[PDB]
């Protein structure tokens, strides 16, 4: 699956939940949130075996179509063929991504105050998108 | 609060469920499904008091920015402040909209074989979008 959601108005405090299933041969997938495809507050990209990266979560921002400095995480609570729910929230200081085992944090570099764009790409099958 | 979902590949037989709450002071809302904003396979529009309509579901299609002939349905199972889930599925011949109280049918006028666009508009707050 790989859909795009626009016309959003997610503000700090609100929670965005993405439920789906990781393909049984996933190279990796990504979950981007921001203003648009060129300006992302967060590029959550768990990589099983993609671009030389093996079982590593890469976080990054994007502004004016330019990638920021990568932030590689130590924890990788994901496995192929796994059905997971990803919860995203943020504030003026950072973005939080919670999965049942680990909570990932990434600084709100762009100082964005609302999310209007969400896109899921890669080897992930979306089953539901919830707002809270 | 009306969002837009693009980049979809909903094939006939697949179920799209929109769950949310109708505002207590709602006058109307709509669920559009199709190719893009100007080419819709279905414009499901429950009107409480909208365009001179009082408690009536108006269904229609749109091709190249032009509405087809309005289809007013006999049943109106909605009430303001009501929390609902609207299920949509289709095939080459017709589109089905299931509401816990009533099921609506509309012919697939355009012969559309996949849904790439979904937009919810009006006095409706979306809580979740599921793909079954």
Give Cα B108 to chain centroid, integer Å: 13
Beta strand spans in A1-132 (E): 4-6, 16-22, 29-36, 39-50, 53-59, 62-63, 66-67, 71-72, 83-90, 94-98, 103-107, 117-122, 124-131
Give Cα A78 to chain centroid, integer Å: 13
**Of the candidates A57, A77, A65, the residue with the CA atom closest to the CA atom of residue A40:** A65
In angstroms, this model's resolution equals 2.2
CB B46 within 8 A of CB B76: yes
**Is B1 at the interface with chain A, CB within 8 A?**
yes
Task: Closest CB to A3: pick one of B5, B128, B132.
Answer: B5
Size of interface A-B (CB pairs under 8 A): 37
Please give the full DSSP string across B24-81, using - where no structure is assigned: TT--BEEEEEEEETTEEEEEEEEEEEETTEEEEEEEEEEETTEE---EE-S-----TT
CB B8 within 8 A of CB B118: yes
A121 to chain B: closest CA residue? B7
Mutate to test the interface with A, among B1, B2, B4, B5 (most CBs of A within 10 A): B5
What angle (nearest 5°) sits at the alpha carbon of residue A13, between those of residues A11 and A19?
A: 90
Residue A84 CA to residue A20 CA, distance in Å, equals 6
Residue A1 CA to residue A18 CA, distance in Å, equals 12
Residue A132 CA to residue B89 CA, distance in Å, equals 26
Tokens of B127: 């809580």
**Greatest CA separation for chain B:** 37
- Residue A51 CB partners (closer than 8 Å, separation 6+): none
Chain B residues inside the 8 Å CB shell of A7: 2-4, 119
CB A19 within 8 A of CB A130: yes
**Is B37 at the interface with chain A, CB within 8 A?**
no
Residue A47 CA to residue B93 CA, distance in Å, equals 42
Per the CB < 8 Å rule, is A7 touching B7? no
Residue A25 CA to residue B31 CA, distance in Å, equals 35
In the 8-state DSSP scheme, what is residue A130?
E
Residue B76 CA to residue B104 CA, distance in Å, equals 10
Question: Which helix H or strand E contains B122, and what residues bound it?
Answer: strand B115-122
Give Cα B124 to chain centroid, integer Å: 12
Domains of chain A: 1-132 (2.60.120.200)
In the 8-state DSSP scheme, what is residue A1?
-
Residue B56 CA to residue B66 CA, distance in Å, equals 21
What Cα–Cα distance (Å) separates residue B2 from each residue in A22, A47, A77, B31, B43?
A: 28, 33, 34, 9, 14
State the virtual CA torsion across A127, A129, A132, B4 in degrees, nearest 10: -160
Residue A108 CA to residue B28 CA, distance in Å, equals 37
Burial of B65 from C-beta contacts in 10 A (0-12 / 13-18 / 19+): exposed
Cα(first)–Cα(last) distance of chain A, in Å?
23
10 Å Cβ neighbour count for B122? Answer: 18
How far A86 CA sits from the closest chain B CA (Å)? 14
Chain A residues inside the 8 Å CB shell of B126: 131
A3 to chain B: closest CA residue? B7
Task: Closest CB to B131: pick one of A9, A126, A130.
Answer: A126
**Of the candidates A33, A45, A38, the residue with the CA atom closest to the CA atom of residue A70:** A45
CB A4 within 8 A of CB B36: no
Task: Closest CB to B4: pick one of A6, A9, A130.
Answer: A6
Chain B residues inside the 8 Å CB shell of A3: 5-8
Burial of A3 from C-beta contacts in 10 A (0-12 / 13-18 / 19+): buried
Binding residue per annotation — B103? no
- The dihedral through the CA atoms of A100, A101, A105, A106 has a sign that is negative
Residue B76 CA to residue B56 CA, distance in Å, equals 6
Residue A52 CA to residue A118 CA, distance in Å, equals 26
Task: Closest CB to B4: pick one of A7, A9, A119.
Answer: A7
Q: Given its phi and psi angles, is residue B64 left (phi above 0), alpha (psi -120 to 50 degrees) or beta?
A: left
Residue B44 CA to residue A69 CA, distance in Å, equals 45
């Amino acid at each position: 699956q790989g859909l795009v959601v626009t016309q959003l108005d997610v503000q700090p405090g609100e929670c965005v939940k993405v439920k789906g299933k990781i393909l049984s041969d996933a190279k990796g997938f990504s979950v981007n949130v921001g203003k648009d495809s060129s300006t992302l507050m967060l590029h959550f990209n768990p990589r099983f075996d993609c671009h030389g990266d093996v079982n590593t979560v890469v976080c990054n921002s994007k502004e004016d179509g330019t990638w920021g400095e990568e932030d590689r995480k130590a924890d990788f609570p994901f496995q192929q063929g796994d059905k997971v729910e990803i919860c995203i929230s943020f504030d003026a200081a950072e973005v939080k991504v919670k999965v049942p085992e680990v909570e990932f944090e990434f600084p709100n570099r762009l100082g964005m105050e609302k999310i209007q764009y969400l896109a899921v790409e890669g080897d992930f099958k979306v089953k539901a998108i919830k707002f809270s």
